[PDB]
Design an enzyme around this catalytic site. Structure first.
Site, PDB file in Angstrom:
ATOM      1  N   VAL A  74      -1.822   3.703   0.437  1.00  0.00           N
ATOM      2  CA  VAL A  74      -1.986   4.863  -0.348  1.00  0.00           C
ATOM      3  C   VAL A  74      -1.925   6.045   0.712  1.00  0.00           C
ATOM      4  O   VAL A  74      -2.908   6.142   1.377  1.00  0.00           O
ATOM      5  CB  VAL A  74      -2.985   5.087  -1.322  1.00  0.00           C
ATOM      6  CG1 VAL A  74      -2.890   6.746  -2.222  1.00  0.00           C
ATOM      7  CG2 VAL A  74      -2.925   4.261  -2.438  1.00  0.00           C
ATOM      8  N   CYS A  75      -0.972   7.092   0.746  1.00  0.00           N
ATOM      9  CA  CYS A  75      -0.965   8.177   1.717  1.00  0.00           C
ATOM     10  C   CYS A  75      -2.232   8.997   1.441  1.00  0.00           C
ATOM     11  O   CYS A  75      -2.508   9.243   0.478  1.00  0.00           O
ATOM     12  CB  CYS A  75       0.141   8.897   1.652  1.00  0.00           C
ATOM     13  SG  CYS A  75       0.548  10.222   2.811  1.00  0.00           S
ATOM     14  N   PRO A  76      -3.095   9.205   2.764  1.00  0.00           N
ATOM     15  CA  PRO A  76      -4.327   9.854   2.337  1.00  0.00           C
ATOM     16  C   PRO A  76      -4.281  11.443   2.533  1.00  0.00           C
ATOM     17  O   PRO A  76      -5.037  12.054   3.302  1.00  0.00           O
ATOM     18  CB  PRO A  76      -5.136   9.241   3.342  1.00  0.00           C
ATOM     19  CG  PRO A  76      -4.430   9.205   4.573  1.00  0.00           C
ATOM     20  CD  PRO A  76      -2.954   8.730   3.907  1.00  0.00           C
TER      21      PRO A  76
END
Ligand SMILES: [Zn+2]
Ligand SMILES: [Zn+2]
Ligand SMILES: [Zn+2]
Ligand SMILES: [Zn+2]
EC number: 1.11.1.24
Lengths: 158, 176, 173, 164, 167, 157, 177, 178, 162, 171
Positions: H47-49
């Site tokens: 998941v792109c943070p």
């Protein structure tokens, strides 16, 4: 019931016939003495009361060992007295040198584990309690033993 | 216990002393006959057994009414027999013409509601059972009196007379 | 219930009909006298009130022995009063020389062990109590003996001035 | 007790005096009809007037509304009949057009919440049950005198107007 | 609920609108006075509040008797106040001589056994409590409606207070 | 206090025993039609003459005469029993026996018979007589083989 | 309650005041649109109704995004309507562009997890629900916050952009797959 | 959990990665500042943070309002350190201008009410706490929302305005009291 | 059972054969010393008692490291002294330099979770306790023979190294 | 916890990193095989991961004896993979030939009795399970570094195939 080797013997309190009269008897009266407590089924049966007479015969033998003997059945004190006052020809016991406790409530026989629940009467049972109230010996069976009783009251002092 | 007015009497069976012999007694043996069942606490006491003497003496009078009289205590049959065989002057009962039942298990006394659970003996109780096994009268007494045998006989008569010839009632009273 | 033979009779207090008026009667009123306390199921039934008439007829006989007769049903004191004020012709009691106690709360019948719990009415019980408040006899009856309770109140008193009849030649051990 | 507005009215079965005769009455007997069920403490009380008479006299008006009126006290049916047949001179009710239910076990009064437990008699209570067996009114108090037949008629009306 | 004739009445503590201001009222405040506690379903209804205005109108009659009249619904005290402020013209109650108590937790209605569990509002209920805090009257129905009967009943209870069971 | 009751079926037991030198399993059902003296003792390799056990082995056949198989029991393993049997007698020992020594290693036999001294994990000196039909007839608990013989003869009239 | 982020929002059915009339509304009536569902404690108080006025004023900006805004308190629909009919000078709301839903049973507040159980009123809650009925954001405030209206709107736009364009994502980040 | 809006936020104590090194941090350190406390489920996912990177990038705007931002996951501080040092191009964070706190006991998550019970990780809860340590807002998002960082910044201003001056109110509105 | 790493070791008290006589040995005795407490199933087995013999021989090498070893089985102290005083040609142990604890109540084996429940004897198990009473090591398996002596030696040094 | 010598091992199901990919693994996949299940406290620590590395080096040796070696810590499978994918010089593990199982719920560690409750991480623990799924060995300590692989090897052989002092004879 509640009888356990090596534990304070189950306490008891009953009306006894002691020399032709009635007295409350209780375990605490025998502090500092040994007690042989024997249970038997029924007054006035057609079976020779060898057992009771033998004990009564030897009772002074037990008293020199510092030991009172007590007989118990579920019969009332009125029946014990009558049985004692009947002579052995008409069936009875004659005079007697040991108390006979009345266990009419059946709690003594229950407390000691000897109550034949189906019939309401005690098994033949023998218990030895020491001068400190500690149950030291248990014996229970059926049909009709005083010598071993004496062996044992010596043994625990030997 | 289980004794309920107007209901079937609690069942019983017991070993009894009967004309000096041991016999087993049960309620069903008396179907068709009235039964007076009375309890007393103990054999061999110093209370005078007038109740028992009286029923024994009057027992043929009950039997003429088709009624059997049974006595009960928690004592064993051996004790009953010893009591019956003891002379009246030594505190005994002497010969007896009614059964005495041994209730050593205390079940008769529990079933009928007269056991003092303290002490383990019956109260002085008396029960009248008709010929259908139905419980029709309960009495409990503190001490005996002997012309209470006379009361039992009157009741037995009364119950049998009511079962047929109606039921009495003052003159000058009507319902609605 | 709580009735124990040879023990202090259960305490009671109730409103009764007395001399055609109400009065609070209680056990303690009767100390030193004998009480015949009897229960019955209902007022104003079609069952002839044999025992109650008889008790009232023999009421003085009882008081001539130091005995008070008290009757009890779960009916109210108003129904009792109505019942007495109904003539026997019409199903009533006519005047009455014993109290009728009202046990509307059913506590008397419970206390004396004669509440037929399924129905909320009393069994036909008779209790005999003496001048110390010890219960001396319990009798319970299917159907409707007044002379009997009278005979008994004496024989509980000659068992105190005299001391129990006993046949000749019976001695204890 | 078990009585709750908007729920089935607690069921009941009792012996009643119905035209001088004893007869079992039960709530189910009245499905499709409204019931006014009123409780009162004691037969043969004369210290105060009784409502029973007024309800009897007005029975037909309740019957025009499709409504059956039932009286209840813990007295027996024998006592109910004796009171009916008592002379009016001595407080008798005379004959009645409504049943009087005997609550000798006290179960009716208990179920309806109106048992005065310290005395064993019912409080004065009035319940109105619709023709579907549903409880629509509760009124209870400890007064020594009825209160009102008229307001019971009004209420029966009002509930039947709200039905439609 | 807990309301039982002849027993102390279920205590209650609530915020009330009393002459356009908020006040805590408690049942204990009223010991020595009669209380008429009536419950109604909803403020700002489209059903004419004929009961509440009447109680307000007859407020003095009750006070002649030493009786206080308390109205209760599950609405808040802010709603009660706005309902009292709003003109009878535009749907309101106008000024009012009886308190309106807010039962927003619905605990008053539960305690008095008048909560329509389904809707979370009170049935129309009427309770009369005497000067010893004992409940003398329970009236509950599901109609939508009463003031003269309340006045009769308080007088009848006060009479039995003074005379006893007699009448 | 355990499950032993006069006139009822004796509490059932199974254990691994030492029988004339070897480990064998003894069940109670093994002694049908036969009388059993079940006798419990506290510990092996103790510091006092095994008089009781010795006495019982000698008169083993006396009991075999009566139709009665004797059976000793402690909480010691069958290894410890076999060791004890095969020690001499000097500073300690036992010698051979004609009676099984059971191993109540689980303590279930002691518990079932009401003889387990719980605070120490060993049996009280207890003795039980069971008849050919399985029924407990005698209970003795102490903390004497002559008396045991007498008792066995009596139960058979 | 039954409000689970990332899951279908609990359905509801309530009576609402929509432009001076009572109407039954259902969460389901709003599939295919975003819903901003906010809760407040009580009508008619002395707390300035800043968020409710802000929502009303911006309601068309919301409908431009295809987002419908719903206000909820445990007050009845009769109280809501009265409050709307009360001028803001008398302390009311004046006419109003968002439905006000009545939660008199308290079930809607309960289901959304914002019922102050000891008081019987709702916390100030704000729920963003997407066009598939999925709960995208839960917010709880202590006091009313007029700026929460502006942010609710910015967030609806962000959710709609992501819906369509996917993950915003910082430069140079790649998963370690 | 224990997080009550408008009450004092639950206390917490934990190890954090602060500018590449470990440093215990606790709620009382931050009295007198605002605190945005945010939670996320796991380090090192695919998941792109976005929100963590947006908070890092904007940490100085927060600090200009005297507001400290604090990220939390049930991952250890060793994992947080490694994650910071992992290149962004292999799923790392790269250098980071906010603390990441380690919640390996799961007690901070549980106390704040955001523990996803059956998985043992946190929901994305965000908590605004004022300078007096009072919990002023609870937010929960399903996924990282870059713009939830702007939102938190604007809400912090908003709350601080309120404290300064007071809550402004629309034109025409006055209560109905006396 | 009640054994937890990093928590205080379960207390124990039992009668032991030390040298050739009896002595109560309690955990508290050993405050300040490491303890190696191992359990074995049964005295007088037919299987060579390799592990006990080994522990006895290395007893003083263990003592060098400030650590006392103790053996345990459910057998009584009497059976222990009989084993010790039996000679090895006849299945016995010969003298020992480690105490042998008697676990006749089975409380030690229960407290350490080693009681092979349906038989009433302990599994082979090794526990290690530091001078402050803390349990630092748990090892249990159902194997016949054990070479845990050297392993126990390495472990003691390790725990002190920290 | 639930781990009892001579009883079926506590069941387990976890996500693991196997050859750089995620895979569900559960006790039941290992029926007919031996399992060495070992627990360690934390990924990415400053303590050299001697035991994990040694178990990976020797993994084929274990497989030749029909034994599978599984590592477990409370870290997630994402952290496991990142640790494997980090070079050993920057503190990583490099490629690994044993599964690492994620115990993020901590149920494995609780079931096996090794969860250090105050910190929420596992003790160093090592369990041997036979191909019947029966637990044969329990070992737990709190050592900073566990030296385990050789002892595990000999134990596994000992369970698969079942000295003696001076003139000692039986009887
Ligand atoms: Zn007056
Ligand atoms: Zn686009
Ligand atoms: Zn597009
Ligand atoms: Zn690198």
């Amino acid at each position: 019931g509640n009888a356990r080797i090596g534990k304070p013997a189950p306490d008891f309190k009953a009306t006894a016939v002691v020399d032709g009269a009635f007295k409350e008897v209780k375990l605490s009266d025998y502090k500092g003495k040994y007690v042989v407590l024997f249970f038997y089924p029924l007054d006035f049966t057609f079976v020779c009361p060898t057992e009771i007479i033998a004990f009564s015969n030897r009772a002074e033998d037990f008293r020199k060992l510092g030991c009172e003997v007590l007989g118990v059945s579920v019969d009332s004190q009125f029946t014990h007295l009558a049985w004692i006052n009947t002579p052995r020809k008409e069936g009875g016991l004659g005079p007697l040198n040991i108390p006979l406790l009345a266990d009419v409530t059946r709690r003594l026989s229950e407390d000691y584990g000897v109550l034949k629940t189906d019939e309401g009467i005690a098994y033949r049972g023998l218990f030895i309690i020491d001068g400190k109230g500690v149950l030291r010996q248990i014996t229970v069976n059926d049909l009709p033993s005083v010598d071993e009783a004496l062996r044992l009251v010596q043994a625990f002092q030997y």
